[PDB]
Design an enzyme around this catalytic site. Structure first.
Site, mmCIF file in Angstrom:
data_model
loop_
_atom_site.group_PDB
_atom_site.id
_atom_site.type_symbol
_atom_site.label_atom_id
_atom_site.label_comp_id
_atom_site.label_asym_id
_atom_site.label_seq_id
_atom_site.Cartn_x
_atom_site.Cartn_y
_atom_site.Cartn_z
ATOM 1 N N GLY A 99 0.804 -1.210 0.000
ATOM 2 C CA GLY A 99 0.000 0.000 0.000
ATOM 3 C C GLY A 99 0.840 1.264 0.000
ATOM 4 N N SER A 100 0.290 2.333 -0.569
ATOM 5 C CA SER A 100 0.938 3.642 -0.568
ATOM 6 C C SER A 100 -0.100 4.750 -0.743
ATOM 7 C CB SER A 100 1.988 3.725 -1.675
ATOM 8 O OG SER A 100 1.395 3.551 -2.947
ATOM 9 N N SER A 153 3.222 4.465 3.562
ATOM 10 C CA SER A 153 3.216 3.155 2.914
ATOM 11 C C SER A 153 2.903 2.019 3.882
ATOM 12 C CB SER A 153 4.564 2.894 2.242
ATOM 13 O OG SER A 153 4.688 3.648 1.049
ATOM 14 N N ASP A 212 -15.894 4.525 8.758
ATOM 15 C CA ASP A 212 -15.283 4.541 7.429
ATOM 16 C C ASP A 212 -15.347 3.167 6.771
ATOM 17 O OD1 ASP A 212 -14.071 5.917 5.315
ATOM 18 O OD2 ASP A 212 -12.047 5.440 6.013
ATOM 19 N N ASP A 242 -8.494 -0.530 9.184
ATOM 20 C CA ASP A 242 -8.364 0.929 9.123
ATOM 21 C C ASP A 242 -9.255 1.642 10.141
ATOM 22 O OD1 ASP A 242 -7.779 3.531 8.457
ATOM 23 O OD2 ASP A 242 -8.054 3.258 6.298
HETATM 24 C C1 LIG Z 1 -1.536 -1.670 8.368
HETATM 25 C C2 LIG Z 1 -2.384 -0.937 7.630
HETATM 26 C C3 LIG Z 1 -3.757 -1.339 7.371
HETATM 27 N N1 LIG Z 1 -3.736 -2.624 6.712
HETATM 28 C C4 LIG Z 1 -3.935 -3.760 7.416
HETATM 29 O O1 LIG Z 1 -4.174 -3.842 8.642
HETATM 30 C C5 LIG Z 1 -3.822 -4.822 6.544
HETATM 31 C C6 LIG Z 1 -3.932 -6.210 6.659
HETATM 32 N N2 LIG Z 1 -3.763 -6.962 5.539
HETATM 33 C C7 LIG Z 1 -3.495 -6.416 4.323
HETATM 34 N N3 LIG Z 1 -3.355 -7.263 3.266
HETATM 35 C C8 LIG Z 1 -3.073 -6.938 1.965
HETATM 36 C C9 LIG Z 1 -3.342 -5.685 1.383
HETATM 37 C C10 LIG Z 1 -3.037 -5.431 0.039
HETATM 38 C C11 LIG Z 1 -2.474 -6.431 -0.786
HETATM 39 N N4 LIG Z 1 -2.178 -6.173 -2.111
HETATM 40 C C12 LIG Z 1 -0.990 -6.769 -2.694
HETATM 41 C C13 LIG Z 1 -0.998 -6.714 -4.249
HETATM 42 O O2 LIG Z 1 -1.417 -5.422 -4.736
HETATM 43 C C14 LIG Z 1 -2.727 -5.078 -4.260
HETATM 44 C C15 LIG Z 1 -2.679 -4.951 -2.719
HETATM 45 C C16 LIG Z 1 -2.212 -7.691 -0.200
HETATM 46 C C17 LIG Z 1 -2.512 -7.945 1.152
HETATM 47 N N5 LIG Z 1 -3.401 -5.061 4.232
HETATM 48 C C18 LIG Z 1 -3.554 -4.266 5.312
HETATM 49 N N6 LIG Z 1 -3.470 -2.928 5.441
HETATM 50 C C19 LIG Z 1 -3.301 -2.097 4.368
HETATM 51 C C20 LIG Z 1 -2.657 -2.460 3.118
HETATM 52 C C21 LIG Z 1 -2.661 -1.482 2.103
HETATM 53 C C22 LIG Z 1 -3.307 -0.238 2.268
HETATM 54 C C23 LIG Z 1 -3.957 0.017 3.531
HETATM 55 C C24 LIG Z 1 -4.667 1.301 3.843
HETATM 56 C C25 LIG Z 1 -3.894 2.091 4.938
HETATM 57 C C26 LIG Z 1 -6.122 0.997 4.312
HETATM 58 O O3 LIG Z 1 -4.762 2.164 2.707
HETATM 59 N N7 LIG Z 1 -3.980 -0.911 4.554
#
Ligand SMILES: C=CCn1c(=O)c2cnc(Nc3ccc(N4CCOCC4)cc3)nc2n1-c1cccc(C(C)(C)O)n1
Ligand SMILES: [Cl-]
Length: 260
Positions: free
Chosen positions: A14-15, A20, A134, A152
C-alpha cells in the site's frame, strides 16, 4: 531501528498520503504482518487525530475474528509504525477490481456471507460503544475458506461521546453530513450496505450531485446480477433515510435472509 531490527521487509502492499504499508516477516516468530509506516503527523492536525483514534481504538477493542488484529504501534525517526495482522487476500476493493478484470463475480451466496461477516465485526465494535465511521471496500480485508475483517480504525469514535471525522463521501449517510451524531452505529450499517452493493457489481458510487442524493432517499444503485427480492429488501432498508429504521448490527446478524 526497531523496524529493521524486528522485521524484514518483503513487499510494499500500500501507498498514499498516509505513507506506505509493507508485508513484513517478523524475525522472532516467522509470521507475516502488515506494517504501516507514516511520517509522524504535525502535532495538532487531522492526521494526528486520525492516528490517535486508531491506537486508542485498540486500547478498547483487543481481538475479534472479523476485525484486523492489532499487535503493536511505535514511533521512530519521526515516523509512526503500526503492526497489524496480514490478510493474504488483500482488500475487498482489490478483489472487486480483480473480478472486473477477469470478468468474475461474487455469488449472491457470497454477498450474504460478506454481509454477515462484516456485520459480526460491527456488532462487536458497537458493543464496545465505538463506531467505525469509514466502512467501505478498501477497509475490508480478506484472509483465505474466506474471512472478512474490518480494518483501518483511523475514523473510529465513541458512540456516547461523538467526535466525528467524516468518512468517504461515497458511503456517507446524510444524517452524518447533517451533523446528526445521535445514531452513528446506523451510519456504519448504511455504509456496509453500499459496500455490498459495490461487491455485487454496481457502477462506481457518486461522490455528490443528483445520484448521491437519490441514494440517500433510500434508492439502491443498479445491480447487474440476479438478487432475490428479499436480499434486495434488506439492502434497501439498510440505506433507509430514517436511521432508526435501519437494522442494528445485532439485528442484522440474526436476520433470516442471512442465516446462514
Ligand atoms: C496496516 C495498515 C492497514 N492494513 C492492514 O491492517 C492490513 C492487513 N492486511 C493487508 N493485506 C493486503 C493488502 C493489500 C495487498 N495487495 C498486494 C498486491 O497489490 C494489491 C494490494 C495484499 C494484502 N493489508 C492491510 N493494510 C493495508 C494495506 C494497504 C493499504 C492500507 C490502507 C492504509 C487501508 O490504505 N492498509
Ligand atoms: Cl443506534
Amino acid at each position: 531501528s526497531r523496524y529493521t531490527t524486528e522485521f524484514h521487509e518483503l513487499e510494499k502492499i500500500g501507498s498514499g498520503e498516509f505513507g506506505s504499508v509493507f508485508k513484513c516477516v517478523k524475525r522472532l516468530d516467522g509470521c507475516i504482518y502488515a506494517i504501516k509506516r507514516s511520517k509522524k503527523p504535525l502535532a495538532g492536525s487531522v492526521d494526528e487525530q486520525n492516528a490517535l483514534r486508531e491506537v486508542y481504538a485498540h486500547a478498547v477493542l483487543g481481538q475479534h475474528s472479523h476485525v484486523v488484529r492489532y499487535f503493536s504501534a511505535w514511533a521512530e525517526d519521526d515516523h509512526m509504525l503500526i503492526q497489524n495482522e496480514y490478510c493474504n487476500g488483500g482488500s475487498l476493493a482489490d478483489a472487486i477490481s480483480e473480478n472486473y478484470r477477469i470478468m468474475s463475480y461474487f455469488k449472491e451466496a457470497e454477498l450474504k456471507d460478506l454481509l454477515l461477516q462484516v456485520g459480526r465485526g460491527l456488532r462487536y465494535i458497537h458493543s464496545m460503544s465505538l463506531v467505525h465511521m469509514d466502512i467501505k471496500p478498501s477497509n475490508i480485508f480478506i484472509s483465505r475458506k474466506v474471512m472478512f475483517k474490518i480494518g483501518d480504525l483511523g475514523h473510529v469514535t465513541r458512540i456516547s461521546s461523538p467526535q466525528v471525522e467524516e468518512g468517504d463521501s461515497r458511503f456517507l449517510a446524510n444524517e452524518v453530513l447533517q451533523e446528526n451524531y445521535t445514531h452513528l452505529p446506523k451510519a456504519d450499517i448504511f455504509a456496509l450496505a453500499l459496500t455490498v452493493v459495490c461487491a455485487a457489481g454496481a457502477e462506481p458510487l457518486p461522490r455528490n450531485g443528483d445520484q448521491w442524493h437519490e441514494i440517500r432517499q433510500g434508492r439502491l444503485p443498479r445491480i447487474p446480477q440476479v438478487l432475490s427480492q428479499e436480499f434486495t429488501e434488506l439492502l434497501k432498508v439498510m440505506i433507509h433515510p430514517d436511521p432508526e429504521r435501519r437494522p442494528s448490527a445485532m439485528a442484522l446478524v440474526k436476520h433470516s435472509v442471512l442465516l446462514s
